[PDB]
Design a protein around this ligand. Sequence first.
Ligand SMILES: CC(=O)N[C@H]1[C@@H](OP(=O)(O)OP(=O)(O)OC[C@H]2O[C@@H](n3ccc(=O)[nH]c3=O)[C@H](O)[C@@H]2O)O[C@H](CO)[C@@H](O)[C@@H]1O[C@H](C)C(=O)N[C@@H](C)C(=O)N[C@H](CCC(=O)N[C@@H](CCCCN)C(=O)O)C(=O)O
Ligand SMILES: CC(=O)N[C@H]1[C@@H](OP(=O)(O)OP(=O)(O)OC[C@H]2O[C@@H](n3ccc(=O)[nH]c3=O)[C@H](O)[C@@H]2O)O[C@H](CO)[C@@H](O)[C@@H]1O[C@H](C)C(=O)N[C@@H](C)C(=O)N[C@H](CCC(=O)N[C@@H](CCCCN)C(=O)O)C(=O)O
Ligand SMILES: [Cl-]
Ligand SMILES: [Cl-]
Ligand SMILES: [K+]
Ligand SMILES: [K+]
Ligand SMILES: [Mg+2]
Ligand SMILES: [Mg+2]
Ligand SMILES: [Mg+2]
Ligand SMILES: [Mg+2]
Lengths: 490, 490
Amino acid sequence: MDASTLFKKVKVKRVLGSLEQQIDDITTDSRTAREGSIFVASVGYTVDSHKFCQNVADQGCKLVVVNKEQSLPANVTQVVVPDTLRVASILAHTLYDYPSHQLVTFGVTGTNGKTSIATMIHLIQRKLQKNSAYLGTNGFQINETKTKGANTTPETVSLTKKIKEAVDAGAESMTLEVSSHGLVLGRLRGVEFDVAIFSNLTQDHLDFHGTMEAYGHAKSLLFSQLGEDLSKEKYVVLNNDDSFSEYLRTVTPYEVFSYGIDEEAQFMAKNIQESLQGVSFDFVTPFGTYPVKSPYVGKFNISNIMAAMIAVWSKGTSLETIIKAVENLEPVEGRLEVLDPSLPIDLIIDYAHTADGMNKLIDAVQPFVKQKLIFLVGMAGERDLTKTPEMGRVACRADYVIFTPDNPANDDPKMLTAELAKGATHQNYIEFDDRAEGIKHAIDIAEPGDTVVLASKGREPYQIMPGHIKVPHRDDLIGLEAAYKKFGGG
Amino acid sequence: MDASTLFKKVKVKRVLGSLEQQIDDITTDSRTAREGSIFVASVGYTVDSHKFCQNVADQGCKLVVVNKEQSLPANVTQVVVPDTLRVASILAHTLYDYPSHQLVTFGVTGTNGKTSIATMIHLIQRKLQKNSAYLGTNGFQINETKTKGANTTPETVSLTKKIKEAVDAGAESMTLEVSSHGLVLGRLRGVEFDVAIFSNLTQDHLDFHGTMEAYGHAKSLLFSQLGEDLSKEKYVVLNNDDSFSEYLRTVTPYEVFSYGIDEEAQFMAKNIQESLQGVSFDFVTPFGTYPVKSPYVGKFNISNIMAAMIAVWSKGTSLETIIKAVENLEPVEGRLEVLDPSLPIDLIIDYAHTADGMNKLIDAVQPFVKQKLIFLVGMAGERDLTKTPEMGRVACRADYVIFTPDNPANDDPKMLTAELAKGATHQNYIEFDDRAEGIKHAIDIAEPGDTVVLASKGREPYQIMPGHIKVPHRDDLIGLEAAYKKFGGG
Ligand SMILES: CC(=O)N[C@H]1[C@@H](OP(=O)(O)OP(=O)(O)OC[C@H]2O[C@@H](n3ccc(=O)[nH]c3=O)[C@H](O)[C@@H]2O)O[C@H](CO)[C@@H](O)[C@@H]1O[C@H](C)C(=O)N[C@@H](C)C(=O)N[C@H](CCC(=O)N[C@@H](CCCCN)C(=O)O)C(=O)O
Ligand SMILES: CC(=O)N[C@H]1[C@@H](OP(=O)(O)OP(=O)(O)OC[C@H]2O[C@@H](n3ccc(=O)[nH]c3=O)[C@H](O)[C@@H]2O)O[C@H](CO)[C@@H](O)[C@@H]1O[C@H](C)C(=O)N[C@@H](C)C(=O)N[C@H](CCC(=O)N[C@@H](CCCCN)C(=O)O)C(=O)O
Ligand SMILES: [Cl-]
Ligand SMILES: [Cl-]
Ligand SMILES: [K+]
Ligand SMILES: [K+]
Ligand SMILES: [Mg+2]
Ligand SMILES: [Mg+2]
Ligand SMILES: [Mg+2]
Ligand SMILES: [Mg+2]
């Protein structure tokens, strides 16, 4: 369409040049701007992209949105606005015909479990033979087609384009992980949600939020941003075992569905039986109690599957059909995955990377340790270290602990492993600057019948290194390649 | 319509009896429930209205919404739900066909100035000859028809009925004051806003919110609850002279318009000239700067009229037509009103009742005191007293200060005046247990050419007394009746 119609949506603007031109693309990355693109400049943590306006002109782009008039050829139209990214989200949703209004959208937020719940909703939808899309830490997925991305919640234009791709591919629904960063930073401006789901709130991301207070209020935006139109069928799904759910109630008018294991809720799990192969439980609901078989491991994953079932049920699918669909659901990549059970050791990978997520992981694996628990964990570079010794303490619930860096970036890897080491409660631990080296060591130390857990990365395919350069790395592959060498069964 | 269709909007319910019945009314007050009403029970601060279910049955009501099965005749249908008031707002907006979707709705929140801004928007709309409604501290107004009410933001059912009355009366827009209580307590569930306006945030209501933190987050709900549909023409209007506006930006995607006098903003007031008769100023806007004449007194009222003009402009009315409409706008009742200027004293009433609102009032009146400033203020009963000595301090900017109770309820009136007295900085003050007696005294003490200010009630027609019984009381009438006696000019 033409720039003219797009910019009628912006009341405060100084327009320098014609808006008669056709527009088919928008971008906040200058490297992809061309004729027919709007390039929207912004000030990032690293660079100020106003500086690349001359590049997009060179590349054919005839329209930039800026916060200050730039030096450009006369024939490039400039639209000067007070808040360029705000305008970016308005222009994006407009250009792509409001993609989040065009399908059912589920949003999941919380400190741990976002990937698990969001992926479980997508997998249920697929099992029911409905087209579905997923966006989050594992990247972007339409039905069974995956690509990897840089964020859990990508910047507004990329994110909006991805919702449009899901609509164009014929998705009937889409599920998004909603990071607390994404919310605060405006990454989700324009994204209408139909169901908002909460997992839990425990200390994380305080290098960004400053306080627990601010962190929780950040996550409440998913709930309050549902809005106020009570003709719409929207729903909220809350964990009654987390005390922040009481606050979440208050920020939204839509009907709330609660789930719980430890505290009373509308939906509960009773009579729980655990195995490394999955769980069974009695699913108390307001309409009756039903036996559920789930392939996922542990109680934390029972909270998670409950959230996912309730989310899908809320939009009109019978509980009986959901419960049946859950039985042979595929593993969630990198989230409590038991690797090749033909190995003579239990080899398990998981993304847990805060003290609370580690306790849930260890709680789930521990009843099944027959001999020694060998536990590897990483601490992330350039993050709040306040609870890192505490991660170290929690790791020491294991018999043998390996400390590694995880995406150390420009931080000294020794600094991070030393920080974890501060909380260790026995002498049975060891630190490696190189995580691949650390995994090969956990295999070396492991006996037949031992349990080995690799925590904090799952199948994440890179280590962020100095310069913020991504280097290939795969806990699962490194661990398997080393476990076959040591145990056979290649 | 029938209960059947209404309750399809509620997913979790236990229905005891038929829903075949016709429903034309909903109520959370048992005293108005009858045949065709839904009575929704709830637990209040005073009583639990579940107890009156037998009364509504006696009165003919055949449908109650409860949080627990009650003792009732068999032919009364009960719908048992986990959150009765949440369901009340859903049922109400449904029954009345979503009244807030049916007109343009402006919402105003902030510690001081809500009544001023909200009333100024209504008055502009009327001046432009458009049907308009107002709801807030001065009660409910359709065009020029007024009724008084008990709250600034009434409980959900009353509030929703009032929006419906405005729609039925043909209102093209409606403006609501949005109290921080109303937001937290769910009074505004279902109410779609098109424009959200912020005045300021300073200490108040902490007996309810506990912290400034929680108090500000409460008010952010108006902004975040606008939602995420960027096809809708919604706008946010923020005061750049208040540092909470920086936080408000972040909780909403809609375009933001800023106003300011002390700090840079998109809309500013320059070259300000003041009189007891009104102000003139240069109104800097993004489209040019225009001379404005306003009937309201002081700089705080210039922030207020700016917010109101920008709100009306945002929905498509030209600034030139608004600016012309503003010139002879009617006084806002109880908000910096200069009473009979034929009196030989300046007699002024105002609602200011926190330390910050008092400073703004005194700032506005002071340049015009020719002799002595005689200042009367009340402290409210059963409220946080932490800043009350500070109100006492601020009052003592006057030459002679009268301390009174304001709605003392069950609090000792001496306790409240004594608390104000704690902050007094000179010996020229006096305390009265009876506020009428106090006003008659301010007249006694006043000379020709003095300024008398009555603060904290405006034209509020009652004193809440022991038992929470309202007794008639009117600062304006009591003051005028006493000023005529003393000065003549009946
Ligand atoms: C600190 C931060 O926010 N930088 C995000 C931000 O960078 P910058 O602001 O530095 O970008 P830069 O300054 O280069 O560019 C600004 C703008 O200029 C543009 N530009 C730039 C260069 C150029 O030549 N041309 C051009 O047009 C560019 O497109 C952008 O529009 O903009 C990028 C693009 O959108 C994101 O990809 C970054 O995200 C990084 C990867 C991140 O790590 N972000 C973290 C903070 C994050 O967002 N986390 C959440 C939650 C996930 C999480 O935090 N997980 C844990 C996991 C820990 C365990 C790991 N196993 C963690 O990482 O701590 C999320 O991903 O949604
Ligand atoms: C503490 C509080 O919230 N009680 C509000 C609340 O009472 P209760 O919970 O005690 O009601 P109660 O317990 O009796 O009844 C519960 C339920 O049972 C029902 N019910 C009751 C009796 C019955 O026989 N049958 C029946 O069906 C009834 O309709 C209700 O649905 O429900 C009423 C009805 O909806 C409101 O009218 C009250 O509001 C009062 C007046 C108030 O003062 N509220 C304050 C806290 C307030 O809301 N303030 C804000 C902001 C304005 C403000 O605070 N201004 C300052 C002004 C100070 C300067 C003054 N010059 C202040 O007052 O401090 C606002 O009004 O939006
Ligand atoms: Cl509940
Ligand atoms: Cl601004
Ligand atoms: K949607
Ligand atoms: K509206
Ligand atoms: Mg997180
Ligand atoms: Mg995730
Ligand atoms: Mg207030
Ligand atoms: Mg008010």
